[PDB]
């Protein structure tokens, strides 16, 4: 069967993967194919076949690897024949490529006339081992296998060729004047060699007659030389032979005679009618006798004359008859002339994206003309335009301008200008005839006509068949593809001129231009249009292109909206109530349940109904919804307790919404308790547990004293069941928050104070100023008197005075404190007339110690004293950090690891990656959660390196790189030592290990690239110092971030760090002898050195979140299914207590995605580009990513259920009864067995 011969190298996971799918353009036998110009051996048989020459058939995975090897030996010859075939006529480069393809056919099928054949024979023999002898050395097997994979190898040999070709898929002209267009390989190879030879020798004869023109000596030496070889090649005959109409926007592909787009640009941008109606050289009918415009042209002057006269006729065709009285006519005619000039320029240059009946013909004609004119020199055509664009432009303006812009962008600008012309024409009635503040009868239809124009499925009178919205999607798709191609490329940086768009200084190609657009921050078409488009072209309404608008919700830019920006609430003149304004937040909504349903997830009918403890379908659904509601709202209140009048108004409406939602839920739970207990706990005992389990779900992870048990009493319950007042108190606090906002080890000095009696506290502030004095104040004077205030107010060997003052005797103390503040201010004035703290002291002392160390010659003395000082202060900090981190619930300087004391006595060091960490949003600089892998990155050894390089940059690019290598190696080693453990002796273990190591490497790269989203106290200081390392104190955007990116990308470092990662995992593999496991080789998922670009951190964290969520969901679901008495209560409680935080994280990251889904540097709140993200909803994004199997390089997540994350986050029946039994048990525990 044919399907038993067709192969796809994208199938083979790895070689000796998911990269040869749609990206075969750049692709067992480890030997590279190397062996070059065309026609050089005339003094064709020798070709790039070296890869197959050393074919090691032993290490081969079916025929797919063989096809990959053939694809490699075809690509490495196509890319080596495209750039080494001198003809200046792509119709012959095409021929060379097709003849190489035909020679690959012959090599594979064994028909090659001239060690290769043995390897191919054995390969086909082992393929036959895989339909056994149903398709001699397997001649017919070879023929059938070729005829099965004939198309793939052709589209791989034709890749990399210039987007403008003549007979190759990248520009197959029909020449009538998805398949292989040549079908040449079926010709016998002797005939193909004879044709190749005659083409070569006669193109060389043409080159000879050009260089040696017919019109002083040796006027026929080369002619007789060529004739001598023409007689000497007689063996081809008697020797070797015997041995054997107002146009509309097309938007569609070029279907033969009709106009439209060229392929790879079809349905990407529409052709303006002017673009299609452009007068051209061929369309230039001058006189009835066509001879003048026919025949051919001789010199550059004739070509320039044709282009000048065509431009003049275009300008004549581009001016209106009466110009409508020349009032409107003005800048519009000049703009149209500019676009025509640009189109002329890009079609002379040959980088046009539109096609036509005559465009393909004239482009080949221009290639031929430019070849025959500039014989003694692609770049010639662009230079000729850049030199001769002045004359044609001035001819155009008689019927230059900066037009070094990609034709895609100009087409986008013209299409959007037309769209805004129509928009303004149909928005103006709304602006004047209607009004925001005829009240309901005129504005209604004046906005409904606008809606009919906008949501028109036929795309009004601009786009030809799809809605403006759908066509804008095709715009964003193509623009983001351009941006991605510009990002991946490396040879596209600005040219040496010895940011304003420059001609040559700023690099000069499409890729160079898009790299410049990335540099200035325009990575999305909306921002680019907000730049190029002039102000007020879409209406008297200020609807920006960067601000977007909304059973399907479409999120599209403001101009492509159903209603004008601002009139969205005056379309029907609806009440401008603060309610709909506050939407610019919550997500919820008598023997009935007033169910507060999450928008989308409604009531879920339980199907598995068995013997129940009076728990009905509706009761279980309500309990599920209540648990979700009081896990989400109880968190939103604390997350929202932390133009402002509008914010407080919206916030008051928000707290009212939560108040009446809770009022609904109170009655709902009362009904639930009644219907449960009449024939169970209450809100007082549920919300209590719902808080307590937090401490059990965060630091205890599953179930089973002094500074935490009291914290739990003060957090919720107050030693009893008071769930009602736990939540009401925080409701009141949140309610008053914005109203109040709008209303707007002991230190030594504690030893001695102003208690001389045992100027009351006034002599202390004088002696303290005297001590600190040895803006009219020394450094940190206010802090000392502040702590003196704290000590004095806490007061009202030391115990005697507090006891005596207590025997003397708190609003009186408050009055004293106020009078004391007044007296201290008076004391400050009197002094002017005559004219934690331990951390601060330790930091200033350590800075002094660093100065002392750098001031050195007896360096061991000061370093030893520094080390013993740290050792002495360790006891003080041991009792210091806990009391301000355990009571409330830097690290390297007092890291207690032994290996720290071994390697690093200067206050690697990595260790096993504990799996106890969870997802938290801390140190981000909103709504993004840090994965534990990022939280556990090693940066310990980067800290002393940074400290040592104070006021030193010589070692900044030298020592820090070595530290980067060391830390990356240790990170990879420890990740592998913990992820291979996850599944001992399993393939998927090392796959997930590779995924995590790649993620860690990407996060390490982004610590040194742009702004690491996470500002962890290690990376915070690291970036705070290495933005000054690469700084000259000029700027903070181009001086620092661009230089840092150039350091990471172009320096003798990305590859070094990845090689450190590989070396770490190799060390892990070699140290797996105690695991008694095969340490033969390292998994080839780390084999790849170049691993691809890094997508933005939020997207990678989204992928990691999806992977972890789906793996833990499968684990917990299987646990709870296998167990469904203590065996199943644990599974159910674990599932719910893991699902609710994941639902909150899902909602937060979904909101963040919704506000960054297609934004950019100029649009998103952070200066990070998210243009490559292209899906409307996070579910839609993960549906096409987290579906297949993990490969370890590109895919980092696999999931069983993909399109119901929103429903899975809220929901299977008996789980409620076991959860209530668990609640009652944990209650009889925490309320009686721990009470005190």
Numbering used by the authors: 23 to 38, 43 to 53, 61 to 68, 71 to 78, 101 to 171, 177 to 192, 194 to 198, 204 to 245, ...
Sentences reproduced from the published study:
VAR2CSA encoded by a subfamily of var genes from Plasmodium falciparum (P. falciparum) named as var2csa, plays a vital role in the cytoadherence of infected erythrocytes to the placenta. In this study, the VAR2CSA ectodomain from P. falciparum strain 3D7 (~306 kDa, containing six Duffy-binding-like (DBL) domains, N-terminal sequence (NTS), and multiple inter-domains (IDs))8 was recombinantly expressed and purified using the Sf9 insect cell secretory system. The cryo-EM structures of VAR2CSA ectodomain and its complex with CSA were determined at a resolution of 3.6 Å and 3.4 Å, respectively. In line with the previously proposed model, our structures showed that the core region is well-defined and covers NTS, DBL1X, DBL2X, ID2a, ID2b, DBL3X, ID3, and DBL4ε.
Compared with the apo structure, the densities of the wing region in the complex were significantly improved, making it feasible for the flexible fitting of both DBL5ε and DBL6ε. Intriguingly, a highly basic pocket formed by DBL2X, DBL1X, NTS, and DBL4ɛ has been identified to accommodate a dodecasaccharide with six sulfated disaccharide repeats from CSA, which fitted well into the density map. Moreover, 16 residues were identified to be responsible for the direct interaction with 10/12 monosaccharides, except for the 6th and 11th units of CSA dodecasaccharide. Among them, there are nine, four, and three residues derived from DBL2X, DBL4ɛ, and NTS, respectively. Furthermore, the nine residues of DBL2X were shown to interact directly with 7/10 monosaccharide units and thus may account for the major contribution to CSA binding. Owing to its high resolution and potential high stability in the core center, DBL4ɛ was used as an immobilized reference for the structural alignment between the VAR2CSA-CSA and VAR2CSA ectodomain. Interestingly, a significant conformational change in the core region was observed. Firstly, the DBL1X moves closer to DBL4ɛ at more than 3.2 Å (ranging from 3.2 Å to 4.4 Å) for multi-helixes to facilitate NTS interaction with CSA and close the pocket. Secondly, there was a 1.8 Å outward bend for the key CSA binding helix of DBL2X in the deep pocket. Lastly, the rest of DBL2X moved about 2 Å inward to shrink the pocket.
